[PDB]
Amino acid sequence: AKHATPKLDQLESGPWPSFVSDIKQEAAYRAANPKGLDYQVPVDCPEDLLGVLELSYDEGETHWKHGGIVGVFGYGGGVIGRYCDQPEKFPGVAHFHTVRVAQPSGKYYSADYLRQLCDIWDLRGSGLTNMHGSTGDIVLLGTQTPQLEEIFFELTHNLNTDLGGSGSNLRTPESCLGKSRCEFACYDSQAACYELTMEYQDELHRPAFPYKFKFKFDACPNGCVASIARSDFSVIGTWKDDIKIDAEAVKAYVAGEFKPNAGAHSGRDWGKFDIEAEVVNRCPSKCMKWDGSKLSIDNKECVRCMHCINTMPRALHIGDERGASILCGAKAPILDGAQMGSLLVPFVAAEEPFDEIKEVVEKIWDWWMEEGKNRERLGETMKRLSFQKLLEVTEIAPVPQHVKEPRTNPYIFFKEEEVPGGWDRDITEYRKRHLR
Amino acid sequence: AKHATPKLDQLESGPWPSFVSDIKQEAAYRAANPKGLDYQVPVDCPEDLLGVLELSYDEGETHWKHGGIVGVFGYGGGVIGRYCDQPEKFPGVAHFHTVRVAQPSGKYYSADYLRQLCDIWDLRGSGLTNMHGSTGDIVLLGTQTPQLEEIFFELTHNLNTDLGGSGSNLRTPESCLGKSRCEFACYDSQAACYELTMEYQDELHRPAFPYKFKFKFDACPNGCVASIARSDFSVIGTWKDDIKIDAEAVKAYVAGEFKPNAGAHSGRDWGKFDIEAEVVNRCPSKCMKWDGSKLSIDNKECVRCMHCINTMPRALHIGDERGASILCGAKAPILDGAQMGSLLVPFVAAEEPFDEIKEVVEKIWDWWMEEGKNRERLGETMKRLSFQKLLEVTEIAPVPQHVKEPRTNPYIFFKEEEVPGGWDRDITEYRKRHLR
Amino acid sequence: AFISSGYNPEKPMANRITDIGPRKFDEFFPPVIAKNFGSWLYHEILEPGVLMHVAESGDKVYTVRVGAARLMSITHIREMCDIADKYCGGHLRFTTRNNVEFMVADEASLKALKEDLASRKFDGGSLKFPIGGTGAGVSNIVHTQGWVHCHTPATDASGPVKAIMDEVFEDFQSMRLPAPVRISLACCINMCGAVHCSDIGVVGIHRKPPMIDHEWTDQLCEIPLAVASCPTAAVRPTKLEIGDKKVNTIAIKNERCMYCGNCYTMCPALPISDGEGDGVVIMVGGKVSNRISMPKFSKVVVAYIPNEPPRWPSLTKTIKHIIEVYSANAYKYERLGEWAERIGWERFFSLTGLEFSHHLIDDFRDPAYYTWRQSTQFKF
Amino acid sequence: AFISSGYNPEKPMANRITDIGPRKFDEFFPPVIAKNFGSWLYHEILEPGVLMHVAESGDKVYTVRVGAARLMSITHIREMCDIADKYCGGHLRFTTRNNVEFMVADEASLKALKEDLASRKFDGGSLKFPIGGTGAGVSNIVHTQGWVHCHTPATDASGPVKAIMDEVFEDFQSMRLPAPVRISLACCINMCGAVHCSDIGVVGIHRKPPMIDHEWTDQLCEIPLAVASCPTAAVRPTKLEIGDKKVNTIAIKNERCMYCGNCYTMCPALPISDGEGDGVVIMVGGKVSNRISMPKFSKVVVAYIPNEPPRWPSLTKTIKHIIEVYSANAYKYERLGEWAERIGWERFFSLTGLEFSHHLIDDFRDPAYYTWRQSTQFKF
Amino acid sequence: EVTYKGKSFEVDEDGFLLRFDDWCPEWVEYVKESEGISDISPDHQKIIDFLQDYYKKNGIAPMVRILSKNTGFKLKEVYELFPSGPGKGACKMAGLPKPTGCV
Amino acid sequence: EVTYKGKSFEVDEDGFLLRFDDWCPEWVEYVKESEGISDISPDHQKIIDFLQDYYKKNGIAPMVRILSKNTGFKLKEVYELFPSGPGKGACKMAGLPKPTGCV
Ligand code: SRM
Ligand code: SRM
Ligand SMILES: C[C@@]1(CC(=O)O)/C2=C/C3N/C(=C\C4=N[C@@H](C[C@H]5N=C(/C=C(\N2)[C@H]1CCC(=O)O)[C@@H](CC(=O)O)[C@@H]5CCC(=O)O)C(CCC(=O)O)=C4CC(=O)O)[C@@](C)(CC(=O)O)[C@@H]3CCC(=O)O
Ligand code: SF4
Ligand code: SF4
Ligand SMILES: O=S([O-])[O-]
Kindly state whether residues D264 and D218 are assigned to the same domain: yes
Calpha distance C167→B306 (Å, rounded):
45
**How would you classify the pairing of strands A128-130 and B295-297?**
unpaired
Q: Which of B315, B327, B348, B358 is nearest to B240 (CA)?
A: B348
Q: Which of A165, A176, A168 is nearest to A216 (CA)?
A: A176
Number of domains in chain E: 2
Calpha distance E78→E91 (Å, rounded):
12
Query: How many residues are present in chain A?
Result: 436
Whether the Cβ atoms of residue C347 and residue A46 lie closer than 8 Å to each other: no
Classify the C-alpha dihedral D18-D21-D26-D27 as positive or negative.
positive
Confirm whether residue A84 is marked as ligand binding: no
Please report, for the domain that includes residue C195, its CATH number: 3.30.413.10
B104 and D24 within 8 Å at the Cβ level: the answer is yes
Kindly state whether residues E22 and E50 are assigned to the same domain: no
Q: Which residue of D has its CA nearest to F34?
A: D9
Q: Which residue of F has its CA nearest to D265?
A: F101
Query: How many residues are present in chain F?
Result: 103
Catalytically annotated residues of F:
102
A409 and B333 within 8 Å at the Cβ level: the answer is yes
Q: What phi and psi, each to the nearest 5 degrees, are found at residue B57?
A: -65, -35
Number of domains in chain D: 3
Our mutation pick for probing the ligand 4 site, out of A181, A183, A193, A222, counting the most ligand atoms within 8 A of Cβ, is A222
**Which domain range does residue C53 map to?**
1-132
* Residue B207 contacts F where some CB pair is shorter than 8 Å: yes
Q: Decide: residue D105, CB within 10 A, 0-12 exposed, 13-18 middle, 19+ buried.
A: middle
Q: Chain D, 320-379: which have a CB under 8 Å from a chain A CB? A: 341, 344-350, 356-364, 366, 368-379
* Terminal Cα-to-Cα distance of chain E (whole angstroms): 25
Kindly state whether residues C282 and C203 are assigned to the same domain: yes
Return the bridge partners of A141, or none.
Answer: A98
Annotated active-site residue E24? The verdict is: no
Q: Which residues contact C277 (CB under 8 A, 6 or more apart)?
A: B419, B420, B421, C206, C207, C208
* Terminal Cα-to-Cα distance of chain A (whole angstroms): 88
The DSSP output letter for A206 is S
A179 and C45 within 8 Å at the Cβ level: the answer is no
Calpha distance A357→A189 (Å, rounded):
12
The CA–CA distances, whole Å, from D359 to A364, B360, C31, D224 equal 21, 41, 54, 30
* Terminal Cα-to-Cα distance of chain D (whole angstroms): 73
Calpha distance E25→E52 (Å, rounded):
12
Q: What phi and psi, each to the nearest 5 degrees, are found at residue E71?
A: -80, -25
**How would you classify the pairing of strands A215-218 and A174-175?**
parallel
D90 and B96 within 8 Å at the Cβ level: the answer is no
DSSP A391-436: HHHTT----GGGBSS--SS------GGGSTT-S---HHHHHHHS--
Q: Is A199 left (phi over 0), alpha (psi -120 to 50) or beta?
A: alpha
Whether the Cβ atoms of residue C156 and residue C312 lie closer than 8 Å to each other: no
Whether the Cβ atoms of residue A163 and residue A79 lie closer than 8 Å to each other: yes
Kindly state whether residues F98 and F54 are assigned to the same domain: yes
Calpha distance B111→B121 (Å, rounded):
15
CB-hemisphere CA count at 13 Å for E53?
Answer: 10
- Burial profile C126-163: b = 16 or more Cβ within 10 angstroms, e = fewer: bbbbbbbbbbbbbbbbbbbbbbbbbbbbbbbbbbbbbb
The CA–CA distances, whole Å, from E87 to A365, E37, E92, E97 equal 21, 15, 7, 10
Number of helices (H) and strands (E), helices first, in chain F?
6, 2
Dihedral angle, C-alpha A33, A35, A36, A37, nearest 10 °: -90
Classify the C-alpha dihedral A396-A397-A399-A404 as positive or negative.
positive
E18 and C220 within 8 Å at the Cβ level: the answer is yes
Whether residue B335 has a cis bond before it, omega within 30° of 0: yes
Q: Decide: residue A2, CB within 10 A, 0-12 exposed, 13-18 middle, 19+ buried.
A: exposed
Task: Give chain F positions within 8 Å (CB) of B73.
Answer: 36, 83-84
E97 and C222 within 8 Å at the Cβ level: the answer is yes
Q: Which of C166, C178, C175, C188 is nearest to C287 (CA)?
A: C178
Confirm whether residue A193 is marked as ligand binding: no
Kindly state whether residues F13 and F28 are assigned to the same domain: yes
Return the bridge partners of A99, or none.
Answer: A79, A140
Chains with 3 or more CB pairs under 8 A to chain D: A, B, C, F
Calpha distance B125→B109 (Å, rounded):
21
Domains for chain B: give ranges and CATH numbers: 1-63 (6.10.140.1420), 64-164 (3.30.70.2500), 165-238+323-436 (3.30.413.10), 239-322 (3.30.70.20)
Kindly state whether residues D255 and D314 are assigned to the same domain: no
Q: Resolution (in Å) of the shown entry?
A: 2.1
**Which domain range does residue F89 map to?**
40-103
Classify the C-alpha dihedral A314-A315-A318-A319 as positive or negative.
positive
E strand segments, chain D: 40-47, 50-55, 60-66, 71-73, 91-94, 100-104, 183-186, 200-205, 235-242, 245-252, 279-284, 299-306
Q: Which residues contact A405 (CB under 8 A, 6 or more apart)?
A: D299, D341, D345, D371
Calpha distance B176→B190 (Å, rounded):
7
Report helix, strand or coil for A361.
Answer: helix
Q: Which residues contact F1 (CB under 8 A, 6 or more apart)?
A: F8, F9, F10, F11
Task: Give chain C positions within 8 Å (CB) of D366.
Answer: 365-367
Q: H or E segment at C52?
A: strand C50-55
Calpha distance C73→C71 (Å, rounded):
7
Measure CB to CB from residue C373 to each of B221, B301, B401 and give the nearest one.
Answer: B401
Give the mutation candidate from A66, A69, A206, A370 for the E interface (greatest E CB count, under 10 A). A69
Confirm whether residue D267 is marked as ligand binding: no
Whether the Cβ atoms of residue A355 and residue A363 lie closer than 8 Å to each other: no
Q: Helices B378-385 and B355-371: crossing angle, nearest 10°?
A: 70
Calpha distance F92→F94 (Å, rounded):
5
The CA–CA distances, whole Å, from B414 to B395, C152, C253 equal 18, 20, 14
Kindly state whether residues D7 and D104 are assigned to the same domain: yes
Q: What phi and psi, each to the nearest 5 degrees, are found at residue A328?
A: -130, 150
Dihedral angle, C-alpha D67, D69, D75, D80, nearest 10 °: 20
Whether the Cβ atoms of residue A336 and residue C231 lie closer than 8 Å to each other: yes
Please report, for the domain that includes residue D26, its CATH number: 3.30.70.3340
- Let me know the angle formed at the C-alpha of C268 by C263 and C272, rounded to the nearest 5 degrees: 60
Calpha distance E29→E37 (Å, rounded):
9
Q: Which residues contact D334 (CB under 8 A, 6 or more apart)?
A: D178, D179, D342
Q: Decide: residue B351, CB within 10 A, 0-12 exposed, 13-18 middle, 19+ buried.
A: middle
Kindly state whether residues D182 and D146 are assigned to the same domain: yes
Kindly state whether residues D351 and D250 are assigned to the same domain: no
Kindly state whether residues C201 and C308 are assigned to the same domain: yes
Of all protein residues, whose CA lies closest to atom 6 belonging to ligand 4? A224
Q: Which of B111, B205, B93 is nearest to B156 (CA)?
A: B205
Whether the Cβ atoms of residue B224 and residue B218 lie closer than 8 Å to each other: yes
Kindly state whether residues C187 and C56 are assigned to the same domain: no
DSSP A26-87: HHHHHHH-TT----SS-TTHHHHHHHHHHHHHHHTS--B-S------TT-S-SEE--BBSST
Kindly state whether residues E90 and E59 are assigned to the same domain: yes
Whether the Cβ atoms of residue D76 and residue B22 lie closer than 8 Å to each other: yes
Calpha distance D245→C111 (Å, rounded):
96
Calpha distance B368→F75 (Å, rounded):
17
The DSSP output letter for A135 is T
| Å from CA of C262 to ligand 1 middle | 13
Q: Which of B413, B425, D366, B245 is nearest to C213 (CA)?
A: B425
* Terminal Cα-to-Cα distance of chain F (whole angstroms): 25
Measure CB to CB from residue C366 to each of B383, B398, B401 and give the nearest one.
Answer: B383
Kindly state whether residues F75 and F50 are assigned to the same domain: yes
Please report, for the domain that includes residue E48, its CATH number: 1.10.10.370
* Residue A414 contacts D where some CB pair is shorter than 8 Å: yes
* Terminal Cα-to-Cα distance of chain B (whole angstroms): 88
Dihedral angle, C-alpha B378, B379, B382, B388, nearest 10 °: 100
Q: Which of A116, A171, A126 is nearest to A147 (CA)?
A: A126
Kindly state whether residues C48 and C185 are assigned to the same domain: no
Kindly state whether residues F44 and F19 are assigned to the same domain: no
CB-hemisphere CA count at 13 Å for B126?
Answer: 32
Report helix, strand or coil for A145.
Answer: helix
Calpha distance A104→A102 (Å, rounded):
7
Kindly state whether residues E96 and E48 are assigned to the same domain: yes
Our mutation pick for probing the ligand 1 site, out of A131, A135, A174, A375, counting the most ligand atoms within 8 A of Cβ, is A135
- Let me know the angle formed at the C-alpha of D345 by D344 and D351, rounded to the nearest 5 degrees: 95
Calpha distance E19→E35 (Å, rounded):
19
| Å from CA of A318 to ligand 4 middle | 12
DSSP C91-108: EEEE-TTS-EEEEESSHH
Dihedral angle, C-alpha C305, C310, C313, C314, nearest 10 °: 0
Q: Which residue of A has its CA nearest to D261?
A: A411
Report helix, strand or coil for B99.
Answer: strand
Q: Decide: residue D243, CB within 10 A, 0-12 exposed, 13-18 middle, 19+ buried.
A: exposed
The DSSP output letter for C47 is E
The DSSP output letter for B396 is -
Kindly state whether residues E16 and E62 are assigned to the same domain: no
Whether the Cβ atoms of residue F97 and residue F16 lie closer than 8 Å to each other: yes
Calpha distance B331→B232 (Å, rounded):
7
Kindly state whether residues D178 and D102 are assigned to the same domain: no
Q: H or E segment at D166?
A: helix D158-168
Confirm whether residue D197 is marked as ligand binding: no
Of all protein residues, whose CA lies closest to atom 2 belonging to ligand 6? F102
Confirm whether residue C88 is marked as ligand binding: no
Kindly state whether residues C166 and C308 are assigned to the same domain: yes
Query: How many residues are present in chain D?
Result: 380
Task: Give chain C positions within 8 Å (CB) of D374.
Answer: 294-295
The CA–CA distances, whole Å, from C241 to B394, C212, C215, C267 equal 43, 14, 10, 20
Kindly state whether residues F23 and F9 are assigned to the same domain: yes
Which residue type does D241 have?
E
Calpha distance D328→D177 (Å, rounded):
9
C229 lines ligand 1 (CB under 6 A): no
Q: Decide: residue C333, CB within 10 A, 0-12 exposed, 13-18 middle, 19+ buried.
A: buried
Other Cβ atoms closer than 10 A to C120 = 14
The DSSP output letter for E88 is I
Whether the Cβ atoms of residue D379 and residue D351 lie closer than 8 Å to each other: no
Please report, for the domain that includes residue F8, its CATH number: 3.30.1420.10
C378 and B343 within 8 Å at the Cβ level: the answer is yes
Which of E13, E76, E100, E102 is an active site residue? E102
Solving technique: X-ray
Measure CB to CB from residue D71 to each of B130, B152, B267 and give the nearest one.
Answer: B130
Calpha distance D321→A17 (Å, rounded):
65
Calpha distance F53→A171 (Å, rounded):
61
- Cα B80 to its chain centre, rounded Å, is 19
Calpha distance A366→A358 (Å, rounded):
12
Kindly state whether residues C158 and C263 are assigned to the same domain: no
Kindly state whether residues E95 and E45 are assigned to the same domain: yes
Return the bridge partners of D357, or none.
Answer: none
Kindly state whether residues F69 and F99 are assigned to the same domain: yes
The CA–CA distances, whole Å, from D240 to D80, D237, D245, D297 equal 59, 10, 8, 43
Other Cβ atoms closer than 10 A to C258 = 22
Kindly state whether residues E55 and E80 are assigned to the same domain: yes
- Structural domain ending residue among the three candidates C235, C252, C272: C272
